[PDB]
Structures are given as structure tokens and as C-alpha cells.
Amino acid sequence: LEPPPSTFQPLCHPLVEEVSKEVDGYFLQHWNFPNEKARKKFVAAGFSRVTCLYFPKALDDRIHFACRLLTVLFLIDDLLEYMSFEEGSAYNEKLIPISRGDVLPDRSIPVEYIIYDLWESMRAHDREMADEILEPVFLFMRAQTDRTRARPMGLGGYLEYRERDVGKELLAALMRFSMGLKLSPSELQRVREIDANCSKHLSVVNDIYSYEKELYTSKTAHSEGGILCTSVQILAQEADVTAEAAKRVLFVMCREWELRHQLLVARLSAEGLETPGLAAYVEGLEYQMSGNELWSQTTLRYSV
Amino acid sequence: LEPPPSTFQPLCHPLVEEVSKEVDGYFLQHWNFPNEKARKKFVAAGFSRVTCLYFPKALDDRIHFACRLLTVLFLIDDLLEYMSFEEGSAYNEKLIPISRGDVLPDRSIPVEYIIYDLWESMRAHDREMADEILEPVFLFMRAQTDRTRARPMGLGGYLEYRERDVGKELLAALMRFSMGLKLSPSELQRVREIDANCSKHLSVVNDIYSYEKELYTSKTAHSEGGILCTSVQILAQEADVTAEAAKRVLFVMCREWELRHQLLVARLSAEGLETPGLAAYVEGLEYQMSGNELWSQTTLRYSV
Ligand SMILES: C=C(C)[C@H]1CC[C@@]2(C)CCC[N@@H+](C)[C@@H]2C1
Ligand SMILES: C=C(C)[C@H]1CC[C@@]2(C)CCC[N@@H+](C)[C@@H]2C1
Ligand SMILES: [Mg+2]
Ligand SMILES: [Mg+2]
Ligand SMILES: [Mg+2]
Ligand SMILES: [Mg+2]
Ligand SMILES: [Mg+2]
Ligand SMILES: [Mg+2]
Ligand SMILES: [Mg+2]
């Protein structure tokens, strides 16, 4: 479908090609793929490409960390579709003390030592900023198997939940880590509304492009893990239109959230509340929204 | 507010002007308007014009009946805004047996004898078709003061409620009455989906244009009777955008309903289920949709 006009200019990290080869190559060696078709599909998705589109102004020696984290969480996200909520929760909860470093990984299990080595290397580079990503990640991981996915949801309730399932906080903390962007608790508190608005944009844009994939998943995967949980289906139900019609309407709403983002940012400066770090932060949020769109509309993950 | 492209072409009844003078003249003579400013505002609204846009193919000697019914229901609709739900209910329930003709009107009370004389004359012209408007009107009347108006609603739940509050069913029965268009129970059951889709279009288009009037009413009139009940406010809540942003998204949504209307009619025709009566009926529904939009975007009722 044709995207409505956007004033957001998507940016990609300069080292995207080098880092993609580095991180793809890593997972191709360590991760247990079912077959050659899955290995090809993994590379075709371009998980480091979306990361570089998400954080184009990340520091050169930190971008690979973000690519590794997003890549493994992508792989797990698909893995959970074949599990019940109970099995999926146990799977995630196992990785949490390992992510903290409190528990050694079983080195015969790829997901365990990949997660462990990753978080160790991140704390080794920047202990303080790496630690601030932990809880936001665990927040996301626990939302993935929340029983609310099996409950009827309206648009408002969905977006409220999706802020965790889309991993808004983890993306924010990881962006700051990758850019070395440090913010006071006061600064963080100032941009709450901007965060909330950005979350809806990320969520719905993903919903729009990943619908066909998730519809197939709902028909073939686990009854619980593969459950269809998206704004596309919700708006289609609520407004009595096709999923395609819902996509077109939702895309216009996304552009309204872009307009709101700009107004909130301009208001932040007008109220004299904008700091140099905050200016870089809200600009970074814009890159996430536009980077998420560019990748979603081009990745084979959603088109095939 | 620029409306998205539409293929629906509006049509107005040829006798719109002379019928307007006849019907406006009647109400100016009988209705208890508080002052001259209110009388001028009443004429400026063009209640017979929107009726003639709703039913452009009504029979020449029946269009005035439709203009009278819509006019008196328009006037009551505004009246209810200064009442509580309880007062509004008692006001409406009083008119229901009078509409049936089971209870005689108090001739000293304009609304009572206007309602009585109207339905009596409509029954005299076409007894059967007039009776089939009764219950749909009563359903609309009771929805006007329903306490669900003051309780939390999502988009879907609102559209389901608004179908009664927008009087979709009475508008259909009135259209058939005015055109002398008789349909069998079987025939009406075949276009139920088309009716439901049409209702959402009428509702939201009205919501979009009448928002400024209703926002002001909610701030100035009775906190119950004048309560803000509109898709504009609801979508603005769910998506956390301005009312203006909600309008733009809702208008695109209206175009999807127009597209659905065309698909449903085309399928009805392809299945060989589109009788001559149904073809006129579904065309009549389109006139209601395009006619509602034309009047809404030009009437002084919403612009002043
Ligand atoms: C892989 C992640 C880090 C999470 C957060 C980021 C995303 C919402 C972006 C869209 C795709 N989903 C799978 C991921 C899931
Ligand atoms: C007053 C009526 C006859 C109903 C049916 C017709 C309308 C939907 C037209 C828009 C305004 N509303 C108030 C009315 C409500
Ligand atoms: Mg997923
Ligand atoms: Mg997921
Ligand atoms: Mg998705
Ligand atoms: Mg673009
Ligand atoms: Mg009203
Ligand atoms: Mg009303
Ligand atoms: Mg209105």
C-alpha cells in the first residue's frame, strides 16, 4: 500500500554493511536454525539493517551491541509463537538472571550463552548504561506472554499494552546506550508524553506491515503463542472494514502522531524545557519512527 | 477541513424550495420558538433542505411528510440538550403513545399536537408504510436519553449505539415511505449489512462536521443532555490525538465505508439478489450518505 506523505527523513548508520556482515555471521555460527531456508530467511530479514535505521547516530563502537540484542530478541519473538503462554514465560524467565549475569549459561544452549556473552560485553563497555537496559528488556519479555493477549482489547487498551510488547522502553534505553546519551531522571520525566506518542507510531507501523505474516502465524502456529494481537485486526473489527482498509486508516493516524511529535517537541522548547541532551533524544525518537517505517516496507520478513 | 475524494454524487429533490417554505412556515406558525433570533437560526439551518438531500427521489406529494418529521425531531434533539437524562426520557416517552395515535394531544402544547397531526396525516396518506416508521422512531428516541451515553465507549461500541441515536432505521423507513417503495421482509434482510455500513457513514460524517457545535453545547448546556457523544471525541481519546486529527482520520474511514457499500451492492447484484426494489433502495442509501455530507459541510447549523 502507498504510504501517506511524511516529513520524517529516515537515516541509516554509516557502518550498516560492515556491522550486518559481522552480526549476521555471528548468529549464523552460533544460533540453531532448523534448516537452510531459515538461515536464508534470517539474513534476508536484515535485523542489523533495522537496528541501523533505528539508531543511525549511534557511536561506531557501540552499534554492533544494539544489532546483537535486537537480533536475538527478534529470533526469540518468533520462537514464542510455537509455545503456550506458560512455556513462553518459562523460556523468557530463564534468560533473565542470565541477562543480569547472576547465572552462568548452559553453553550447549545457544540462546543462553549468546544472551550471557552479549550482556557481559555490554557491561564491559559501559556498565552504567548497560544496566539501564535490563529492566526495560525484562518488561518487554514479560509482556510477550501476558495473558492479556488472549483477552478482547479496544484500540486504547491495546496501545497501552503494546507499549511494553513493542519494547518502547528498551528501545529508548538502548538508543541512549548506543549513543552514549545520558539523561537525568528529570529530563526523562519531561519527555514522557513524547515517548507515549512515539510508542503508538512504532506499534501501529509495525502492525500495518506485519499483518499478513501474523495472520498466517495465527492459522498455523500455537493457539496461544500465535494469537493475532494487532491494531489492524482491532480497527477492522471495531469499524467493520477489511484489514486492508484498516491499514490505510491507521497509516493516516500514524502521520497524525508524527504531527503530534513535532508539536510536543516545539512545545518543549517553547516552555524552555529543552536541554541539549533532550534535543538529541527526541530527534533520536524520530529516527526510530522513520527508520521503523523504511525497514518495515522493504524487509522480506513482512513481504514473504 | 478538506474532505478526501468521493465517487458519491449528491442529489436534491426538485421541490426543495417550495416545500421548505411550506414546512418552515408551519413550524414558524405553531412551534414555540423563544425569540426572533431562534426563529432566524431555525430557518438558516435548512432542515427541509437536508431532508430533500436525504430523499431526492421521494414522491412529490410525500416529501413534505419527511420534512416535517425530520424538522420536529431536529427541534426536539436540541431541546434535550438542556434537560437531564430523566427529563429527556419523560419528554420523549410522552410523545410515543401520541405518535401511535393512542393518546390525544394537549392542544395547548405545540409539540404534542404537531406530533399527533403529523402521524395522523401520514397514516391517512399511507397507513401501512407510516406504521413501519413508528418503532424505528421510538428506538431512536430512547437512545437519545440512554445512560450508555454517559458511560465509557470504544469506537465499535459507539457505532453500535449511534446507529440508534442517528436514527438510521427511521431514516430508512421514512425513505421507503416517501418514495412509496415497499420491500418484503426477505428483501430487507438481504441488505442488512449494507444498512449497518451506511449507518456508520451517516454517523461519523455528522460527528465530523457538528463537533464544534457539540463541544460548545457540552460546555454550556446540561451536563447530561448536552454530553459530548461523538466518534471524534472517542477516537481522539483512544489514539491520544486532537479532535482535528481525529476528524481527518475519521473522514478517510468514511471513504472506506463508501468503498464497502459499493462492494456489498456489487456482490448483491452478482448473486442475482438485487431486485428492482433493492436497486432503488441501495441507491437511496447512497443519496442519504452523499446528501448528508453536502448539507453538513454547508449548513449554518454547524458553521455558526
Ligand atoms: C526485537 C525487539 C528488540 C523487540 C522491540 C522492537 C520491535 C518491536 C520492532 C518491531 C519488530 N519486533 C519484533 C521488535 C521486538
Ligand atoms: C432527527 C432525526 C430525524 C434523526 C435522523 C436524521 C439525522 C441523523 C440527520 C443529522 C442530524 N440528526 C439529528 C438527525 C437525527
Ligand atoms: Mg512477532
Ligand atoms: Mg512480538
Ligand atoms: Mg508485528
Ligand atoms: Mg518514505
Ligand atoms: Mg444533536
Ligand atoms: Mg442527537
Ligand atoms: Mg452531531
XYZ file of C-alpha atoms and ligand atoms in Angstrom:
645
model
C 0.000 0.000 0.000
C 1.088 3.581 -0.698
C 2.285 5.372 2.460
C 0.820 8.863 3.075
C 3.284 11.794 2.850
C 5.724 12.086 5.751
C 8.029 14.935 6.768
C 10.281 12.473 8.603
C 13.547 11.755 6.800
C 14.795 8.236 7.649
C 18.513 7.910 8.394
C 20.756 4.847 8.458
C 24.006 4.256 10.340
C 27.073 4.577 8.042
C 28.520 1.204 9.097
C 25.357 -0.777 8.346
C 27.025 -3.032 5.754
C 30.051 -3.912 7.893
C 28.018 -4.465 11.064
C 25.365 -6.543 9.273
C 28.017 -8.941 7.979
C 29.590 -9.087 11.445
C 26.382 -9.780 13.376
C 24.665 -11.998 10.789
C 27.861 -14.044 10.588
C 27.898 -14.415 14.367
C 24.343 -15.730 14.608
C 24.865 -17.962 11.570
C 27.628 -19.707 13.523
C 26.016 -19.862 16.967
C 22.229 -19.922 16.538
C 20.465 -23.227 15.853
C 18.437 -22.750 12.678
C 16.042 -25.554 11.618
C 17.325 -25.571 8.021
C 18.965 -23.695 5.146
C 15.669 -21.997 4.301
C 15.519 -20.494 7.796
C 19.147 -19.360 7.560
C 18.480 -17.612 4.243
C 15.336 -16.050 5.686
C 17.246 -14.750 8.708
C 19.790 -12.946 6.528
C 17.037 -11.705 4.216
C 15.259 -10.034 7.142
C 18.176 -7.681 7.756
C 17.972 -7.433 11.538
C 21.091 -5.263 11.663
C 19.637 -3.051 8.933
C 16.595 -2.144 11.032
C 18.850 -1.538 14.033
C 20.984 0.866 11.992
C 17.803 2.561 10.790
C 16.595 2.769 14.395
C 19.840 4.228 15.743
C 21.611 5.983 12.844
C 23.557 8.298 15.170
C 24.843 5.532 17.427
C 28.560 5.574 18.244
C 30.662 3.498 15.842
C 31.932 1.122 18.543
C 28.509 0.591 20.124
C 26.169 -0.019 17.177
C 27.062 -3.721 16.989
C 25.818 -4.250 20.560
C 22.371 -2.946 19.613
C 22.314 -5.099 16.474
C 23.122 -8.200 18.524
C 20.441 -7.503 21.136
C 17.709 -6.719 18.608
C 18.693 -9.741 16.519
C 18.366 -12.237 19.375
C 15.110 -10.711 20.637
C 13.780 -10.944 17.074
C 14.657 -14.645 16.960
C 13.060 -15.283 20.358
C 9.932 -13.318 19.391
C 9.354 -15.794 16.554
C 10.247 -18.747 18.779
C 7.497 -17.840 21.262
C 4.820 -18.210 18.570
C 5.113 -22.003 18.825
C 4.760 -22.064 22.611
C 1.919 -21.605 25.065
C 1.937 -18.524 27.297
C 3.185 -20.774 30.094
C 6.002 -22.345 28.057
C 6.900 -18.946 26.614
C 7.097 -17.333 30.039
C 9.353 -20.091 31.395
C 11.592 -19.691 28.353
C 11.937 -15.935 28.904
C 12.266 -16.084 32.697
C 15.202 -18.469 32.265
C 17.110 -15.840 30.274
C 16.534 -13.050 32.802
C 19.044 -13.973 35.538
C 21.411 -14.910 32.715
C 20.976 -11.444 31.202
C 21.717 -9.959 34.616
C 24.841 -12.111 34.772
C 23.752 -13.649 38.068
C 23.596 -17.101 36.478
C 26.036 -18.889 34.159
C 24.647 -20.087 30.801
C 24.429 -23.672 29.571
C 26.997 -23.417 26.776
C 25.251 -26.215 24.892
C 22.215 -23.951 24.521
C 22.888 -21.111 22.010
C 20.214 -18.725 23.295
C 21.630 -18.950 26.814
C 25.290 -18.188 26.066
C 24.546 -15.681 23.308
C 22.463 -13.667 25.770
C 25.072 -14.036 28.523
C 28.099 -13.095 26.403
C 26.211 -10.161 24.906
C 25.231 -8.584 28.225
C 28.704 -9.200 29.649
C 30.331 -7.401 26.722
C 27.861 -4.519 27.047
C 28.578 -4.059 30.753
C 32.281 -4.280 29.898
C 31.955 -1.341 27.508
C 29.612 0.805 29.610
C 28.424 -0.720 32.888
C 26.128 2.116 33.966
C 24.257 2.496 30.666
C 24.051 -1.251 30.004
C 22.357 -1.796 33.365
C 19.639 0.713 32.495
C 18.517 -1.524 29.628
C 17.923 -4.608 31.793
C 14.545 -3.821 33.370
C 13.115 -2.279 30.167
C 14.041 -5.517 28.366
C 12.535 -7.716 31.096
C 9.433 -5.527 30.894
C 9.206 -6.342 27.187
C 9.952 -10.051 27.662
C 7.210 -10.439 30.267
C 4.697 -8.585 28.101
C 5.212 -11.112 25.300
C 3.398 -13.836 27.244
C 0.973 -11.625 29.155
C -2.445 -13.301 29.252
C -3.988 -10.034 28.052
C -3.098 -11.150 24.511
C -5.946 -13.645 24.897
C -8.421 -11.002 26.072
C -10.584 -8.739 23.890
C -8.986 -5.290 23.608
C -10.076 -1.905 22.308
C -7.713 0.418 20.449
C -6.802 2.426 23.552
C -6.211 -0.598 25.764
C -4.175 -2.290 23.043
C -1.806 0.648 22.526
C -1.403 0.894 26.288
C -0.344 -2.754 26.411
C 1.639 -2.648 23.163
C 3.984 -0.015 24.595
C 5.534 -2.913 26.513
C 5.150 -5.619 23.858
C 6.720 -3.295 21.280
C 9.514 -2.703 23.791
C 9.332 1.097 23.831
C 11.441 1.485 26.982
C 14.102 -0.985 25.857
C 14.441 0.801 22.523
C 14.820 4.088 24.400
C 17.444 2.824 26.845
C 19.310 1.001 24.077
C 19.327 4.126 21.905
C 20.837 6.098 24.784
C 23.416 3.375 25.403
C 24.415 3.194 21.737
C 24.742 6.980 21.514
C 26.260 7.381 24.965
C 23.357 9.746 25.582
C 22.992 10.279 29.325
C 19.835 11.900 30.683
C 18.895 12.964 34.207
C 15.717 11.494 35.748
C 14.254 14.995 35.438
C 14.941 15.107 31.695
C 13.457 11.627 31.242
C 10.329 12.733 33.093
C 9.951 15.731 30.777
C 9.513 13.672 27.607
C 7.015 11.084 28.869
C 4.232 12.279 26.571
C 6.655 12.259 23.643
C 7.620 8.677 24.494
C 3.979 7.603 24.695
C 3.151 9.169 21.333
C 6.228 7.652 19.682
C 5.264 4.222 21.023
C 1.936 4.276 19.175
C 3.700 5.150 15.924
C 6.198 2.291 16.242
C 3.492 -0.184 17.220
C 0.955 0.625 14.509
C 3.518 0.975 11.699
C 4.737 -2.489 12.627
C 1.141 -3.756 12.826
C 0.398 -2.405 9.356
C 3.264 -4.177 7.585
C 3.481 -7.370 9.649
C -0.223 -8.192 9.483
C -0.008 -10.755 6.667
C 2.805 -12.565 8.473
C 0.912 -12.573 11.770
C -2.345 -13.681 10.147
C -0.571 -16.749 8.773
C 1.027 -17.342 12.173
C -2.391 -17.301 13.847
C -3.559 -20.040 11.483
C -0.540 -22.344 11.725
C 1.334 -21.756 14.993
C 0.361 -22.340 18.624
C -3.162 -21.435 19.764
C -1.793 -19.060 22.403
C 1.670 -18.056 21.201
C 0.490 -17.456 17.657
C -2.518 -15.398 18.713
C -3.391 -12.430 16.497
C -2.709 -9.297 18.531
C -2.625 -6.168 16.394
C -4.326 -2.810 15.857
C -5.125 -3.808 12.271
C -7.447 -6.597 13.393
C -8.850 -4.422 16.179
C -9.776 -1.460 13.970
C -11.157 -3.850 11.342
C -13.449 -5.361 13.990
C -14.428 -2.047 15.607
C -15.139 -0.223 12.346
C -16.354 -3.209 10.313
C -13.900 -2.953 7.421
C -11.296 -5.147 5.737
C -7.807 -5.471 7.197
C -6.530 -3.533 4.190
C -8.980 -0.697 4.849
C -7.862 -0.642 8.477
C -4.236 -0.359 7.347
C -4.956 2.724 5.217
C -6.862 4.410 8.042
C -4.199 3.520 10.622
C -1.448 4.900 8.386
C -3.174 8.294 8.375
C -3.309 8.101 12.169
C 0.439 7.431 12.205
C 1.002 10.645 10.268
C -1.072 12.454 12.894
C 1.214 11.054 15.585
C 4.147 12.444 13.605
C 2.460 15.840 13.628
C 1.890 15.496 17.369
C 5.535 14.572 17.929
C 6.615 17.796 16.221
C 4.145 19.871 18.244
C 5.251 18.298 21.522
C 8.907 18.909 20.672
C 8.246 22.532 19.684
C 6.287 22.983 22.912
C 9.204 21.534 24.876
C 11.455 24.286 23.527
C 8.767 26.950 23.947
C 8.355 26.032 27.617
C 12.127 26.414 27.941
C 12.414 22.778 28.977
C 14.652 21.538 26.171
C 18.212 20.567 27.046
C 20.968 19.648 24.559
C 20.592 16.001 25.593
C 16.815 16.194 25.250
C 17.152 17.700 21.779
C 19.277 14.727 20.728
C 16.862 12.337 22.422
C 13.625 13.458 20.750
C 15.480 13.625 17.434
C 16.569 10.046 18.067
C 12.952 9.057 18.649
C 12.100 10.480 15.232
C 14.776 8.278 13.647
C 13.162 5.268 15.314
C 9.756 6.104 13.847
C 11.031 6.790 10.325
C 13.635 4.018 10.455
C 10.979 1.542 11.557
C 8.789 2.518 8.611
C 11.529 2.328 5.960
C 12.619 -1.125 7.100
C 9.084 -2.481 7.536
C 8.061 -1.529 3.999
C 11.183 -3.103 2.468
C 12.095 -6.160 4.570
C 11.396 -9.672 3.266
C 10.246 -10.544 6.785
C 6.903 -8.891 6.030
C 6.655 -9.296 2.247
C 7.286 -13.057 2.125
C -11.023 20.633 6.609
C -10.555 19.166 3.127
C -12.685 16.052 2.506
C -10.985 13.077 0.798
C -12.115 12.216 -2.762
C -15.525 10.560 -3.109
C -17.408 8.980 -6.007
C -20.779 9.579 -4.344
C -22.675 12.360 -6.126
C -25.352 14.189 -4.101
C -28.856 14.785 -5.442
C -31.509 17.199 -4.179
C -35.283 16.919 -4.501
C -36.621 19.256 -7.241
C -39.282 20.766 -4.945
C -36.821 21.619 -2.153
C -37.554 25.373 -2.101
C -41.363 25.350 -2.139
C -41.507 22.506 0.384
C -39.025 24.374 2.598
C -41.306 27.406 2.727
C -44.317 25.174 3.432
C -42.652 23.246 6.269
C -40.653 26.124 7.781
C -43.838 28.193 7.608
C -45.805 25.564 9.511
C -43.286 25.328 12.348
C -42.805 29.104 12.486
C -46.572 29.292 12.955
C -47.004 26.530 15.541
C -43.697 25.720 17.276
C -42.859 27.603 20.470
C -39.682 29.431 19.489
C -38.318 31.541 22.381
C -37.438 34.594 20.279
C -36.765 36.074 16.834
C -33.086 35.108 16.919
C -34.100 31.463 17.372
C -36.618 31.669 14.524
C -33.967 33.012 12.149
C -31.497 30.332 13.238
C -34.168 27.696 12.601
C -34.714 28.877 9.025
C -30.967 29.261 8.486
C -30.421 25.587 9.345
C -32.260 24.351 6.253
C -33.989 21.328 7.776
C -36.145 20.731 4.693
C -33.055 21.084 2.510
C -31.199 18.236 4.236
C -34.393 16.167 4.072
C -34.611 16.806 0.326
C -30.937 15.863 0.039
C -31.598 12.680 2.017
C -34.577 11.673 -0.134
C -34.136 13.332 -3.555
C -36.353 10.737 -5.259
C -39.244 10.990 -2.805
C -42.695 11.260 -4.380
C -43.767 14.875 -4.932
C -46.770 14.585 -2.599
C -44.906 12.779 0.184
C -41.643 14.716 0.554
C -43.305 17.246 2.873
C -44.175 14.489 5.360
C -40.482 13.625 5.623
C -39.520 17.284 6.027
C -41.987 17.683 8.904
C -40.868 14.568 10.781
C -37.165 15.386 10.491
C -37.799 19.031 11.412
C -39.700 18.258 14.622
C -37.112 15.635 15.599
C -34.334 18.145 14.927
C -36.039 20.632 17.246
C -36.522 18.053 19.998
C -32.902 16.957 19.600
C -31.746 20.461 20.530
C -34.355 20.687 23.295
C -32.981 17.571 25.000
C -29.581 19.235 25.425
C -30.917 21.462 28.224
C -32.555 18.559 30.060
C -31.260 15.742 32.230
C -31.493 12.144 31.013
C -34.538 11.708 33.244
C -36.304 14.824 31.935
C -35.390 13.922 28.365
C -36.802 10.432 28.811
C -40.075 11.725 30.295
C -40.311 14.247 27.461
C -39.859 11.619 24.745
C -41.977 8.873 26.337
C -44.860 11.338 26.475
C -44.796 11.680 22.682
C -44.739 7.942 21.937
C -48.389 6.981 22.554
C -49.334 10.278 20.904
C -47.345 9.270 17.811
C -49.194 5.945 17.744
C -52.451 7.872 18.000
C -53.401 6.028 21.181
C -53.374 9.212 23.269
C -54.826 12.586 22.262
C -52.536 15.656 22.362
C -52.795 18.632 24.687
C -53.747 21.291 22.137
C -52.093 23.957 24.295
C -48.745 22.206 23.879
C -47.276 22.650 20.355
C -45.002 19.584 20.302
C -47.900 17.310 21.260
C -50.406 18.319 18.584
C -47.705 18.762 15.938
C -46.570 15.176 16.539
C -50.164 13.916 16.636
C -51.356 15.726 13.496
C -48.231 14.634 11.612
C -48.604 10.899 12.194
C -52.368 11.088 11.649
C -51.890 12.718 8.248
C -49.120 10.257 7.368
C -51.389 7.338 8.244
C -54.169 8.852 6.133
C -51.894 9.037 3.087
C -50.335 5.585 3.512
C -51.369 3.631 6.613
C -49.118 0.586 6.226
C -45.890 2.390 5.339
C -46.481 5.010 8.039
C -46.872 2.378 10.764
C -43.492 0.894 9.853
C -41.792 4.160 10.806
C -43.187 4.192 14.361
C -40.970 1.710 16.220
C -37.752 2.829 14.469
C -38.512 6.374 15.644
C -39.197 5.200 19.205
C -35.932 3.251 19.168
C -34.134 6.462 18.218
C -35.980 8.469 20.879
C -34.997 6.095 23.673
C -31.364 6.021 22.567
C -31.234 9.816 22.874
C -31.500 9.672 26.663
C -29.947 6.240 27.224
C -27.455 6.320 30.117
C -24.920 4.472 27.949
C -24.327 7.965 26.537
C -22.508 8.901 29.752
C -20.531 5.662 30.091
C -17.142 4.674 28.564
C -17.329 3.551 24.933
C -14.872 2.309 22.340
C -15.208 3.065 18.632
C -17.091 -0.160 17.895
C -19.450 0.115 20.853
C -20.162 3.724 19.963
C -21.019 2.981 16.319
C -23.342 0.239 17.548
C -25.067 2.719 19.856
C -25.042 5.592 17.350
C -26.974 3.550 14.796
C -29.975 4.099 17.064
C -29.056 7.643 18.102
C -28.536 8.648 14.463
C -31.927 7.107 13.699
C -30.647 5.002 10.798
C -33.673 2.725 10.929
C -36.247 5.529 10.967
C -34.428 7.222 8.084
C -34.716 4.013 6.071
C -38.419 3.553 6.817
C -39.022 7.236 6.082
C -37.160 6.935 2.779
C -39.264 3.952 1.734
C -42.414 5.770 2.851
C -41.544 8.946 0.945
C -40.753 7.007 -2.233
C -43.660 4.594 -1.862
C -41.008 1.885 -2.006
C -42.314 -1.348 -0.487
C -39.873 -4.138 0.330
C -40.572 -7.620 1.674
C -39.078 -8.852 4.982
C -36.869 -11.163 2.900
C -35.622 -8.254 0.771
C -34.851 -6.079 3.797
C -32.902 -8.952 5.349
C -30.673 -9.112 2.274
C -29.407 -5.546 2.704
C -28.957 -5.609 6.476
C -25.164 -5.494 6.128
C -25.492 -2.566 3.725
C -27.732 -0.749 6.210
C -25.262 -1.233 9.065
C -22.391 0.059 6.931
C -24.465 3.058 5.826
C -25.254 3.943 9.444
C -21.576 4.356 10.335
C -21.059 6.726 7.409
C -24.043 8.910 8.347
C -22.971 8.958 11.994
C -19.300 9.837 11.543
C -19.873 12.406 8.784
C -22.301 14.161 11.110
C -19.860 13.805 14.012
C -17.045 15.348 11.987
C -18.945 18.498 10.989
C -21.096 19.007 14.080
C -18.213 18.684 16.538
C -17.662 22.398 17.180
C -21.374 22.860 17.878
C -21.417 19.893 20.255
C -18.203 20.838 22.061
C -19.753 24.215 22.822
C -23.021 22.590 23.920
C -21.190 20.313 26.358
C -19.540 23.349 27.955
C -22.700 25.457 28.167
C -25.814 23.254 28.344
C -26.892 20.471 30.711
C -24.025 18.185 31.750
C -26.134 15.141 30.840
C -28.359 16.178 27.942
C -25.536 18.128 26.348
C -22.871 15.499 26.986
C -20.219 15.038 24.304
C -21.161 11.884 22.399
C -19.210 11.599 19.160
C -16.686 9.428 17.328
C -14.441 12.497 17.116
C -14.006 12.641 20.883
C -13.713 8.860 21.209
C -11.038 8.341 18.550
C -9.181 11.337 19.992
C -9.204 9.513 23.341
C -8.149 6.095 22.050
C -5.381 7.412 19.803
C -4.393 10.360 22.009
C -4.667 12.977 19.263
C -6.509 16.280 18.880
C -10.131 16.373 17.742
C -8.945 17.930 14.485
C -6.587 14.999 13.941
C -9.413 12.575 14.725
C -11.627 14.221 12.100
C -9.057 13.714 9.337
C -8.628 10.049 10.235
C -12.395 9.532 10.523
C -13.001 11.094 7.106
C -10.617 8.644 5.444
C -12.538 5.972 7.339
C -15.809 7.235 5.841
C -14.370 6.726 2.356
C -13.642 3.103 3.253
C -17.305 2.663 4.184
C -18.282 4.135 0.817
C -15.976 1.598 -0.810
C -17.542 -1.175 1.265
C -21.025 -0.011 0.262
C -20.044 -0.351 -3.397
C -18.543 -3.811 -2.860
C -21.605 -5.048 -0.967
C -24.013 -3.725 -3.602
C -21.908 -5.234 -6.399
C -21.924 -8.620 -4.649
C -25.677 -8.381 -4.047
C -26.086 -7.778 -7.778
C -23.667 -10.536 -8.829
C -25.528 -13.104 -6.713
C -28.675 -12.170 -8.624
C -30.231 -10.910 -5.397
C -30.646 -7.258 -6.385
C -34.365 -6.854 -7.070
C -35.699 -3.679 -8.739
C -36.847 -2.518 -5.296
C -33.464 -3.230 -3.722
C -31.635 -1.395 -6.510
C -33.726 1.699 -5.786
C -33.259 1.193 -2.045
C -29.458 0.884 -2.050
C -29.267 3.845 -4.421
C -31.439 5.702 -1.934
C -28.967 4.904 0.834
C -26.166 6.411 -1.237
C -28.208 9.594 -1.635
C -28.513 9.707 2.154
C -24.743 9.407 2.546
C -23.706 11.980 -0.066
C -26.653 14.217 0.796
C -25.747 14.160 4.480
C -22.191 15.218 3.676
C -23.194 18.078 1.344
C -25.591 19.638 3.844
C -23.233 19.067 6.787
C -20.364 20.923 5.098
C -22.559 23.917 4.173
C -25.320 24.292 6.792
C -25.097 27.251 9.181
C -26.136 24.876 11.963
C -22.568 23.551 12.135
C -20.635 26.590 10.902
C -22.331 29.089 13.228
C 13.218 -7.443 18.947
C 12.954 -6.429 19.754
C 14.087 -5.680 20.389
C 11.543 -6.013 20.065
C 11.439 -4.488 20.116
C 11.489 -3.841 18.735
C 10.411 -4.406 17.825
C 9.039 -4.163 18.437
C 10.475 -3.745 16.458
C 9.496 -4.418 15.505
C 9.753 -5.921 15.449
N 9.632 -6.502 16.794
C 9.888 -7.950 16.736
C 10.627 -5.903 17.692
C 10.554 -6.592 19.053
C -33.664 13.927 13.980
C -33.676 12.892 13.156
C -34.858 12.677 12.260
C -32.526 11.924 13.113
C -32.299 11.401 11.692
C -31.615 12.399 10.757
C -30.325 12.932 11.357
C -29.362 11.779 11.598
C -29.657 13.923 10.421
C -28.457 14.538 11.123
C -28.900 15.224 12.408
N -29.535 14.257 13.317
C -30.060 14.968 14.491
C -30.679 13.598 12.677
C -31.256 12.576 13.654
Mg 6.282 -11.033 16.429
Mg 6.002 -9.923 19.275
Mg 4.098 -7.119 14.251
Mg 9.252 7.240 2.620
Mg -27.836 16.889 18.332
Mg -28.727 13.771 18.802
Mg -23.837 15.647 15.615
